A paper describes a structure:
Non-ribosomal peptide synthetases are important enzymes for the assembly of complex peptide natural products. Within these multi-modular assembly lines, condensation domains perform the central function of chain assembly, typically by forming a peptide bond between two peptidyl carrier protein (PCP)-bound substrates. To address this, we report the structure and biochemical characterization of complexes of a PCP domain bearing a stable analog of the acyl acceptor complexed to the acceptor site of a C domain from the NRPS that biosynthesizes fuscachelin in the thermophile Thermobifida fusca. The C3 domain of the didomain resembles other members of its class, comprising a pseudo-dimer of CAT domains with bridge (R2923 to T2944) and floor loop (A2843 to L2858) regions.
The crystals belonged to the P212121 space group, with the unit cell comprising two highly similar copies of the PCP2-C3 construct (RMSD (all atoms) 0.74 Å). In the PCP2-C3 didomain structure, the PCP2 domain sits at the acceptor-PCP binding site (near the opening of the acceptor substrate channel) on the C3 domain from the second chain in the asymmetric unit. The interface between the PCP2 domain and C3 domain is mostly hydrophobic in nature (537/510 Å2 buried surface area (chain A/B) excluding PPant), with the side chains of V2534, L2515, L2518, F2508, and F2538 of the PCP domain playing a major role in the interaction along with residues A2907, V2908, V2584, L2580, and W2579 of the C domain. We were surprised, therefore, to find that this construct crystallized with the PCP2 domain positioned at the acceptor-PCP binding site of the C3 domain of the second chain in the asymmetric unit. Mass spectrometric analysis of the PCP2-C3 didomain construct revealed a 340 Dalton mass increase, consistent with attachment of PPant to S2514, likely installed by the phosphopantetheinyl transferase EntD that phosphopantetheinylates some PCP domains when they are expressed in E. coli. Having confirmed the presence of a PPant arm, we modeled this into the electron density observed in our structure. Interestingly, we found that this did not extend into the active site of the C domain, but instead curled back towards the outer surface of the C domain. The side chain of R2577 appears to block the channel that leads to the active site of the C domain. Access of the PPant arm to the C domain active site appears to be gated by R2577, which repels the unmodified PPant arm (or neutral/negatively charged substrates) in favor of the aminoacyl-PPant.
Author numbering: 2481 to 2550, 2557 to 2999
The structure:
């Protein structure tokens, strides 16, 4: 859960009165001492629901370490260790068997490069990347028991690297290349394309992963390692690499041993599932949302992307509102989405799905893989509260949920047993997420680089609101909507209405919702 990490940073900043806190910034090296250390733990006791003392601060002086401190550590298995599929990977494989996703679970990463890269050096660098990260060369094959992992040896992993020439606009070409399907039984879950043409200055480098091998937090290590391997291979050498503290299979094995069996009443899995069964009792099948078309018989996973720019002064005001009320920026956005759906007539019981990263362990905090569980965050709006009251409700709901974040979403579904439809995501149909793009990726491959956004043609749910921060200060709200249900202009209006809710909440949070 990254939310613990963000509030620790928030408290460090308020007590040291700085603007310098990263996840690895040492509290004592930052000018903190024991007198202020008690102010930090006193504030953390009030925000988080947990006992914290100077003891914890001493042994875990950074936000990332303190967050993880508040289950065994990942251990490296032997060189002959077989691959292990996490429950995350099994669920994603299962989705691709039930549905025709049309690439909805591919994730793009596109980088504008001022110089055209060398294709032979790039292909060699991708081989180094795939050799380093076993998850990038692990196939999934169907057997009578179910899906089984197949780890390709580095010499046997055929990388897919090619140059493509843009005829029309590159933006639509990026989305087209991104949506191409992976055969997970025969192709490694990574595709690399270098887009060139006379309308593009330099090239656009597009990495496409299937989510089975990468979440959005993998962007930074993917770019960092690809950059290291490219510059090394351009000088004619293999990269000088400190080996990985853990492979994805190590994390999956450690996690599954700890989780246990759902039939074991003492297992963490059963105990967390029992929390969710009670927390999701009498859950609505779906929310009454204003759509343009009824739910079709079959889900097409077609979608679009409506964007709402946020002025830097509004981004700052949302940050200050969160700090003043002791919540994260995500919690403010989550409350705003709940207000929005409430005002649209969805009722007082608003369940919103949200991805939570299981990256607290040092050995996986900055590695490549899929670590996102989906939690159902159930917001109650009865008794017409103020926005400040709602922020208190949302913090309570989120913190109780984050303490049971390891229950796999598919097990929670099978525990809650909701009425199921192939055209409707179970338990929730609106997702809210907070994302931060990599920083310091502006000078990769010895050139000038900048991330470029890919316009999705797909959607996973009815609605996904994302507060997305770029690596350099700015922020915007992206609404990924199901085209089956919503026209583009209705989505543009929805995301504009969310911005208006945020503006009103910052201006005066003491007004009822
Ligand atoms: P804080 O760490 O800034 O300041 C406390 C102190 C360094 C001034 C010091 O006087 C102190 O903590 N002494 C207590 C340490 C101690 O005796 N440990 C208990 C285990 S025997």
């Amino acid at each position: 859960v990254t939310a613990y990490e963000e509030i620790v940073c928030q408290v460090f900043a308020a007590v040291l009165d700085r603007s310098d806190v990263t996840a690895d910034a040492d509290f004592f090296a930052l000018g903190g001492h024991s007198l202020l250390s008690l102010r930090v733990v006193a504030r953390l006791r009030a925000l988080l629901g947990v006992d914290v003392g100077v003891r914890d601060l001493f042994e875990a002086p950074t936000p990332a370490a303190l967050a993880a401190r508040l289950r065994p550590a990942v251990t490296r298995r032997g060189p002959d260790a077989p691959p292990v599929l996490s429950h995350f990977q099994r669920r994603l494989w299962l989705i691709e068997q039930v549905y025709q996703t049309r690439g909805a679970y591919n994730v793009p990463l596109a980088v504008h490069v001022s110089d055209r890269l060398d294709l032979d050096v790039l292909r060699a660098a991708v081989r180094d990347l795939v050799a380093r990260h076993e998850v990038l060369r692990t196939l999934v094959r169907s057997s009578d028991d179910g899906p089984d992992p197949v780890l390709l040896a580095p010499e046997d992993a055929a990388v897919d690297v090619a140059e493509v020439q843009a005829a029309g606009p590159v933006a639509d070409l990026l989305a087209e290349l991104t949506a191409q399907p992976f055969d997970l039984a025969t192709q490694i879950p990574l595709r690399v394309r270098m887009i060139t043409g006379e309308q593009v200055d330099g090239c656009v480098l597009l990495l496409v992963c299937h989510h089975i091998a990468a979440d959005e937090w993998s962007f930074a290590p993917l770019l960092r390692d690809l950059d290291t391997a490219y510059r090394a291979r351009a000088a004619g050498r293999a990269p000088d690499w400190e080996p990985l503290p853990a492979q994805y299979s190590d994390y999956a094995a450690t996690l599954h041993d700890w989780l246990g069996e759902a039939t074991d009443p003492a297992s963490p899995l059963r105990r967390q599932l029992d929390y969710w069964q009670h927390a999701l009792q009498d859950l609505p099948d779906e929310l009454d949302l204003p759509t343009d078309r009824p739910r079709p018989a079959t889900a097409s996973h077609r979608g679009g992307l409506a964007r709402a720019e946020l002025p830097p002064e509004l981004v700052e005001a949302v940050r200050r509102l969160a700090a003043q009320h002791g919540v994260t920026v995500f919690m403010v956005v989550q409350a705003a989405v709940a207000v929005l759906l409430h005002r649209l007539g969805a009722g007082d019981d608003i369940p919103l799905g949200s991805p939570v990263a299981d990256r607290a362990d040092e050995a996986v905090h900055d590695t490549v893989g899929f670590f996102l569980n989906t939690l159902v965050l159930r917001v109650n709006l009865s008794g017409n509260p103020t926005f400040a009251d709602l922020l208190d409700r949302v913090r309570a709901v989120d913190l109780e949920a984050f303490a049971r974040a390891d229950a796999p979403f598919d097990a929670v579904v099978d525990t809650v047993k909701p009425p199921r439809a192939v055209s409707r995501h179970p338990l929730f149909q609106t997702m809210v997420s907070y994302q931060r793009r990599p920083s310091d990726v502006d000078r990769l491959f010895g050139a000038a680089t900048r991330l470029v956004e890919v316009p999705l043609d797909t959607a996973k749910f009815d609605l996904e609101f994302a507060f997305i921060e770029d690596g350099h200060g700015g922020a915007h709200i992206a609404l990924n909507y199901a085209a089956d249900l919503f026209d583009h202009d209705s989505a543009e209006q929805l995301v504009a209405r969310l911005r208006t809710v945020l503006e009103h909440a910052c201006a005066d949070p003491c007004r009822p919702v």
